[PDB]
From a paper:
Hyp-1, the protein product (comprised of 159 residues) of the hyp-1 gene in [name] has a picturesque history. That study, however, could never be replicated and instead the crystal structure of the Hyp-1 protein revealed the canonical PR-10-fold strongly suggesting classification in class 10 of the superfamily of plant Pathogenesis-Related (PR-10) proteins. The characteristic PR-10-fold, also known as the Betv1 fold according to the first protein from this class, a birch (Betula verucosa) pollen allergen to have its crystal structure determined, consists of a large seven-stranded antiparallel β-sheet forming a baseball-glove grip over a long C-terminal helix α3, which is the most variable element of the PR-10 structure. In the case of Hyp-1, we observe two separated internal chambers (1 and 2), each with its own entrance (E1 and E2, respectively), and a third site (3) which is formed as a deep invagination of the protein surface.
In this work we present high resolution crystal structure of Hyp-1 in complex with melatonin, demonstrating that this physiological ligand utilizes the same internal docking sites as ANS. The Hyp-1/MEL structure is the first example reported in the Protein Data Bank (PDB) of melatonin bound to a plant protein, and the second case with any protein, the first one being human quinone reductase. Careful examination of difference electron density maps revealed the positions of 204 water molecules as well as of two molecules of MEL, one of which (modeled in two orientations, with average B-factor of 54.5 Å2) is most likely endowed with rotational degrees of freedom within the surface invagination, and another one (modeled in one orientation with of 36.1 Å2) is well stabilized in the internal cavity of the protein. In addition, there are three Na+ ions included in the model, two of which are octahedrally coordinated by the protein (one by loop L5 and another one by strand β1 and the C-end of helix α3), and a third one partially occupied within the protein cavity. The MEL molecule at site 1 that has the best definition in electron density, makes direct contacts with the protein only via weak (3.6–3.8 Å) hydrophobic interactions with Phe39, Leu31, Leu65, Val91, Gly136, and Lys139, as well as via water-mediated hydrogen bonds of its O21 atom with Gly136 (O), Ala140 (N), and Met68 (Sδ), and of its N1 atom with Arg93 (Nη2) and Glu132 (O). Interestingly, the MEL1 ligand is additionally stabilized and pushed to its binding site by a direct hydrogen bond of its N2 atom with the carboxylate group of Asp48 from loop L4 of an adjacent Hyp-1 molecule. The MEL3 ligand is evidently rotating between the jaws of the vise formed by the side chains of Lys33 and Tyr150. Although we did not model melatonin at site 2, it is quite obvious that the electron density there is consistent with the shape of the indole ring. The three binding sites identified in the Hyp-1/MEL complex are exactly the same as in the Hyp-1/ANS complex.
Residue numbers in the entry: -4 to 159
The structure:
Amino acid sequence: IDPFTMAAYTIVKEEESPIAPHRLFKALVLERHQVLVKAQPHVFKSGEIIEGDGGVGTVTKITFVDGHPLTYMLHKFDEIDAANFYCKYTLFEGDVLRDNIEKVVYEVKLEAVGGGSKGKITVTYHPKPGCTVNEEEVKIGEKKAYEFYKQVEEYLAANPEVFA
Ligand SMILES: COc1ccc2[nH]cc(CCNC(C)=O)c2c1
Ligand SMILES: COc1ccc2[nH]cc(CCNC(C)=O)c2c1
Ligand code: NA
Ligand code: NA
Ligand code: NA
């Protein structure tokens, strides 16, 4: 990428759901660390806030089960506007970043539409300088994120009290 110092690569996705936005904002953003463990206990050992109160500045730690190739991830809540279902958060540490990635930055913005939602999600990979993004790992991340979203949607539809 010379003469550049660094690069950033972005995926933009738009989605629609029958789940109301405040419920998705909790399940998929603010309490994702908890919900991953509930949804996929054979993959995730634990998910915990290790700094902060659940608003801006929070750091979470998600730990995979010992048998899984991956070990842990740290995310930081960089910006939250909960009234308007906006969050920016960053995956800044963990062996899911492999050798090549410095951080992944996520932006989520939801809106209410009838009894459901629409959302825009923006995922930006920041390779370390001199390193290249691995397309395989990006596509796995995307597929797993989508699968998890669908699991959450199904559970929330079936259990209206959750995150109500
Ligand atoms: C969404 O939940 C899952 C479930 C199973 C999984 N396996 C491996 C990953 C990590 C995927 N990479 C990133 C950057 O997310 C994963 C995530
Ligand atoms: C307890 O709270 C929650 C909250 C959000 C959730 N999403 C998913 C599940 C679990 C069940 N899912 C399956 C079998 O696919 C879940 C539980
Ligand atoms: Na959908
Ligand atoms: Na592991
Ligand atoms: Na992704």
